[PDB]
Each structure stands twice: as C-alpha cells, then as structure tokens.
Amino acid sequence: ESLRDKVLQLQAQCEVMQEIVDQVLESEQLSVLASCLQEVLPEEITEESLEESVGKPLYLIFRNLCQSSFSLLLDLLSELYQKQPKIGYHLLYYLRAAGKMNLYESFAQATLHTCLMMDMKACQEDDVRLLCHLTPSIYTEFPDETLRSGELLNMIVAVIDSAQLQELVCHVMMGNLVMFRKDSVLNILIQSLDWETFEQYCAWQLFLAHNIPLETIIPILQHLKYKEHPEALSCLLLQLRREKPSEEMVKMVLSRPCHPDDQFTTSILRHWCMKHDELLAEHIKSLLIKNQLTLEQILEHLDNLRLNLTNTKQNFFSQTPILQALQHVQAAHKMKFSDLFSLAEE
Amino acid sequence: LDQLDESLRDKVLQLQAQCEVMQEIVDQVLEEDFDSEQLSVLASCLQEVLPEEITEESLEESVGKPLYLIFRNLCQMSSFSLLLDLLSELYQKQPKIGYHLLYYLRAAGKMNLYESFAQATLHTCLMMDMKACQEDDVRLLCHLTPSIYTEFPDETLRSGELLNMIVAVIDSAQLQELVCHVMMGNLVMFRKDSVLNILIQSLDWETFEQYCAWQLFLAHNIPLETIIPILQHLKYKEHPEALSCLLLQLRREKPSEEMVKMVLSRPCHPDDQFTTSILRHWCMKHDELLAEHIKSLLIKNQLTLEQILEHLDNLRLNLTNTKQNFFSQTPILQALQHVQASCDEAHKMKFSDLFSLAEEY
C-alpha cells in the first residue's frame, strides 16, 4: 500500500505514520519489519522538555493507543515487541502527556511480570540512567510484581552508582519509592546474601532507607556465616547496637556459633551490657533457665564477654539476675567455666 | 664475595640454627668501633610474615628467627641505648624492618621501644613504616592496626593519613573485623577533636574508601552533632556516600536545633532531596519538637530567611503525599506569622501558599 510506502519515502513524520494508524482498522509482519528496519534520556532532565524527545516517530504509536475500540490496534505494537524487544521499555519511558501506565499491562498481555522483568533487564543493560529514572514509577504502578522477589532489586543494585543509590534512598525516604514489604524483606535479604559486595551494601542501605523495624529481619542472624557474609554482618551489627535488646534478639545473637575469629556476638553483647545493663541481664537470665542454644554455648559467649569486660569499668557481672542465673544453672562442662561461676560464688 | 672481616659473621654467612650464631655477632657489636657497622648491615641486608593460623603459639614461631634477636637483645635493655645504631643502619639500608619491629613488638614488653628506633631520622617514621607495610602486606597491616592506634594515639589520630592508608586497601571482611575491634574496646580511630576535620578531608577519597571511613566512624561512639557541621561541605552531586550515610544516621536522631540549622543551611536544588527527606522523617516522628526548633530558628535565635522558607515550602508540597499535621503545630504557625510580619513583600507572594497555612481558616 502506497501510504506506508510514503512513510518509507520520507525516511515531521507524525501525520505520515498517522496514515498507517488510520489504516490499521482492517499480514502485519511486513509493516512491523519496515517499521523496525526504519528505526533516550535528555542530558538535562527538565520537566516537559524531557517530553521534547518523547514525541518523534515511533512513540506516536503509543499515543494512538492512549486513546471501547481501545483494543483493535495493540496487535501492531505486539508484533513490534515480538520483533524488537527494546520498545517494551520505551513504552514504559513514554508512559512516564500520557494518562496512566495502565496501558503497559494491556501491552504485556500479548507475549506482565516476565515482560516487566525482561524490559527492565534490557533497559539496565542498555541505559542505566533510564533504569534509575524509571525505577520509582515502576515499583509504584506495579507493586505486586516488583515487591515479591529480589530479581528487580538485584538488577538495580548490580549496576547502580553511589549517586544513584543516594537518589534512590531519597526517593524511598520521600514517599515516592517502596522496594521492600514487611512480608518479603526477609526472603529478599536472605537472597541478597549471595550478591556482590557493593550490591549487598546497596540492598542494606535501601532497607534502612525504609521504615521496617530491625526485628522483622533479625532472624537473618541464623543465616549470617562468619567467613562468608561480611557486609550483612557489619550492617546488622551497626544497626543492632542502636536497639533496645529484646529477648529474641539476644537469643538470636547467642544462637550463633562460637568461632575465635568471630567478634559479632561479643561486640553487640558488650554494647548492650554497657548501655542496657539490667535489661540484658534480665534477658540472659530468662534464657539461662532453660528457654542449638545449648547451655555451654551461652556460657562460652558469657565467658568471652566477661574476659572482654575487664577492658573497661563495667559492673555488668554484678547484676543480680546474672548471678542468680549463674548459681541456679551451675547445679560435665563445669571445669570449663569455673571463673564465670566463681563471680556468683566467692 | 661480600667485602668482609670477622669470622662469626662469616659463619652466619657460611650456613646460608642461626640464632645463637647471630647473638655471637650481637654480643660482639658492643665494644666496637662505630665506623664499621655499615658493612655488617650491608651484609645482613643483602642476606635477606603472618602465620596462616594466628595462634599466640605460632606467631611466636615467627617472632624467633635470626633478625628479631636484635630486637630481643634490645628488649632486655644506662646501656639501654648503645646498640640502636646497627638497626638504624639496617633501616637506612632495608626500610621494611621498620614495621617488622612493630610486628615483633606485637613476646616483647611494651612498644615504647619503637620510638627509640624512630629517633634515627616518630610520627613520620610511623607513617612511612605503616605505608610500607600497607604496600607489602595488607593482612599484616590489618592485624597491626589496633596496637598502632593504641600505643600511638597522638600520632595516628592527628591526620587521616593512616585511615586513608587502611581504607585504600582494606577488604569487606577486614573492615568487619576492624569495626568489631572498634566495638570491643581494642581500636579507636577517631576522636571528638580531629574527627570533623578528618572526615572533611576524607571527602576527597574514592567511593569505597569513604564508605569504609563512615562505617568505621559509626562503629565508634562519637555523637553525630560533633560532626554535623560537615553538612556545610557536602555538595549534592559530588558527595553521594557521605550524604547517604549521614541521612541514614540522622534518621536515628531526635532533631537538635543545630542539626536542623545545618540541614536548613544547605542549598535548595530540585535534584537534592536530603533536607526534605530528613525533615519529613523528623516531622513524622517528632513533629512538634522539629516545629519548636524551626520556630526558634525563624525568629532568628549562611541561613537567610528565604532559604528556610523555601525548604519549608518544599516540605509542605511533599507532605500532601501523607497524613502529616506538621503545619498545624503551633510553634510553626506562630513563627510563620512572626516572619510574615517582617518579611520582604516579594517573599509574601513568593510563599503565599506557605504563609496561608498560618493565616487562613
């Protein structure tokens, strides 16, 4: 047909393609092949002049689908996406004088979650800046597809820069971006335990940028392995110091192996016993009376704490709960911890 | 082969079990001309760290050895001075020994020997030896940092030289072991004196170096306020790491008046979301305290008035996102009215929206 050949001929191409647009209201692979063989972020992202580039030739298709009979013309762009995958995220770019991104769902249903993931991976590989400036709206318009698994989170953190991580934490702290949910955050961090160094630091900073209380994720302490997981251990230590210790947190801290090169437990216990002395004493007393966390593990962690607390002026082993618990407990492993029991005896 | 002299040193050369053979030389270099030691140390230098399992029964395997005996013979030292010339010439020939001594000092008594060795040119000696150690063996530098910072606080807390040295090569696991050492009372790398200047200097380092510096600072117990003036120096595009860490740590603070002064005293850029983020956080958890501080700042107790007003208008335009009665607090409305009364007519229509919150009902 000769109008489509006129569009081929010109290459102010908007009305020229509106010719085809008007004609596709009653064998499209050749049209989409022509369109594909025919064919992102402005350097200064200024509002309403970033849409200066959003016009142009191909994006006009998007426009004609943003206006019932709203269904008999997305087949063309479905064939475009089946030919050229990149347009899949270009649409997202266009959608962010459009209405709302509720069009993209309708576009996805011709291949939502796997479409979003592939388009976002292509965007990540090609243009990182576009992925940054697209992440908030993506996570907002599609929460039940993006908050469930660290796929998209890993995608972002694998390529993100420190300045891009700063703009992302800002977006989180401003009410514009939400990347975790109290449901999935634990699963997602246990998954994150396998990522690169800076990827894991980015994940943890982004989690702190939300307002999810530490306890929701303190079970992760089970999974934190001395040799294997430095970043999550460091962030969890530096955040746990700032918390009033619950009994479950001190159980989780004591339920980690005693390795002579592992300084997490004794560090956090020293901090707690110096600022929350009687509360920590109460919790470890309640733990000592039979609440693996074998008794000798608690005793060894406490003996490490005792041998360390001589560094400072700390009457923590004078607390009445701890001496009460020590004498109650003492009544095989005995010769191992004589000193400890001796603080509650002599 | 090597311009030579005395036969005890020649037996040590012949073997190359060398410990007593070398203490022979040690004892011989007591009643000696101080002219012929450069060739002895040249022989010793042309002659020539951490055990894989660092057990205080296999690190003392390495503290033995032939050269360390010199150190040993000086750790029983009046006549406590007349034998540092030999190792001074060793250091002038082979610099590495400078930190080996430190290693030796970490079944020795106390490290007050190292100063006596340094006086052969303490601070620049420490810095050169620690830089050489950083260059050669990072693992030794890590396992030596605590004692270095402890035995010489006034030499290592003075400038970020040593901190930069460590963070430039450190690993994430070694950064975790260092944060642990800090949190255990064994290592202190900042002090309320220098910490502010030291971080302002750190603002020029690489990404991961700055991340390490900030993590290590949080591992200490220096309150944020002591370093909150650094917000003046933090520039939006250029300093992401310090801004992000400062944001996530300011999140955990009940806002002081100086902290809100420092947050309000940074420029308003439409891509800079630091101030409005932290203000949103504060006004959502401690709304009326933040309002009290902004009232005391607005009645003037640099921060120009329009800067505060623009930051507050950004906060207002953002707070429509959520349910936040922060602009219903009485301190903030009282302050708004006080400001509006003595306000340039320009800023009246400039912030009409803002002032109307304290005017209309």
Residue numbers in the entry:
A (entry chain B): 576 to 586, 593 to 607, 612 to 624, 634 to 661, 667 to 695, 700 to 714, 719 to 898, 917 to 956, ...
B (entry chain A): 571 to 586, 593 to 624, 634 to 662, 667 to 695, 700 to 714, 719 to 898, 917 to 976
Could you pull the original sentences from the published paper?
A complex composed of Integrator subunit 3 (Ints3), single-stranded DNA-binding protein 1 (SSB1), and SSB-interacting protein 1 (SSBIP1) is required for efficient homologous recombination-dependent repair of double-strand breaks (DSBs) and ataxia-telangiectasia mutated (ATM)-dependent signaling pathways. Ints3 has an N-terminal and a C-terminal domain connected by a linker region. Ints3 also binds 30-mer random ssDNA and does not bind dsRNA, dsDNA, or DNA/RNA hybrid. Both nucleic acid binding and Ints6 binding properties were attributed to the Ints3 C-terminal domain. Here, we present the crystal structure of the Ints3 C-terminal domain, uncovering a HEAT-repeat superhelical fold.
The structure of the human Ints3 C-terminal domain reveals an elongated, HEAT-repeat-like, all α-helical structure. Owing to twists between neighboring repeats, the a- and b-helices form a right-handed α-solenoid. Two copies of the molecule are found in the crystallographic asymmetric unit. Analysis by PISA suggested that a 1702.3 Å2 dimeric surface might be stable and present in solution.
